[PDB]
């Protein structure tokens, strides 16, 4: 199966290739080496999720823009706060398909906004990718109960 870390990272890379000038942030490329990403970002399962997550982003663009901007401008430890936010949604609340998709979409939007802005310090991209990827490991148990990332979107 695919871990949430793999799939989210594949998604950020995939999304990178269909935005901007297509180039890949060093922080992301290094993440693909260190995880190590075995899932291709051109994998059909990544293609589906990428289209879905972008649709969720569009439908909720004002919300995603205001929440992300508020988050990144007031954080003093963005990696820790990724874990804090996740916690509110998924430990102090029950996980659902809805909540999982919103979380993934929000993380992908986060990574796009950071990396499409060349004035963004590397350490910020570094801590943000670190944060969103560890917090997202928390879904593994739940989505495994649900049959995996591949099963969640394709069958139904």
């Amino acid at each position: 199966a695919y871990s949430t870390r793999e799939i989210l990272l594949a998604l950020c890379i995939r999304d990178s290739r269909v935005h901007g000038n297509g180039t890949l942030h060093p922080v992301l490329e290094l993440a693909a080496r260190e995880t190590p990403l075995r899932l291709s970002p051109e994998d059909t399962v990544v293609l589906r999720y990428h289209v879905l997550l972008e649709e969720i982003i569009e439908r909720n663009s004002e919300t995603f823009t205001e929440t992300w901007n508020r988050f990144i401008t007031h954080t003093e430890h963005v990696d820790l706060d990724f874990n804090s936010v996740f916690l509110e949604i998924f430990h102090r609340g029950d996980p659902s398909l809805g909540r999982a998709l919103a979380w993934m979409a929000w993380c992908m939007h986060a990574c796009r906004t950071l990396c499409c802005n060349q004035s963004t310090p590397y350490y910020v991209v570094d801590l943000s990718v670190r944060g969103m990827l560890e917090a997202s490991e928390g879904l593994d148990g739940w989505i495994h109960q649900q049959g995996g990332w591949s099963t969640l979107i394709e069958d139904n």
Binding site: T67, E88, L97, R99
Partner: peptide, 18 residues
């Protein structure tokens, strides 16, 4: 309450999709 609120918005978007 920034983190709590952000998490609430995302909970709502998640819930509006169910």
């Amino acid at each position: 309450d920034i983190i709590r609120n952000i998490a609430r918005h995302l909970a709502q978007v998640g819930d509006s999709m169910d």
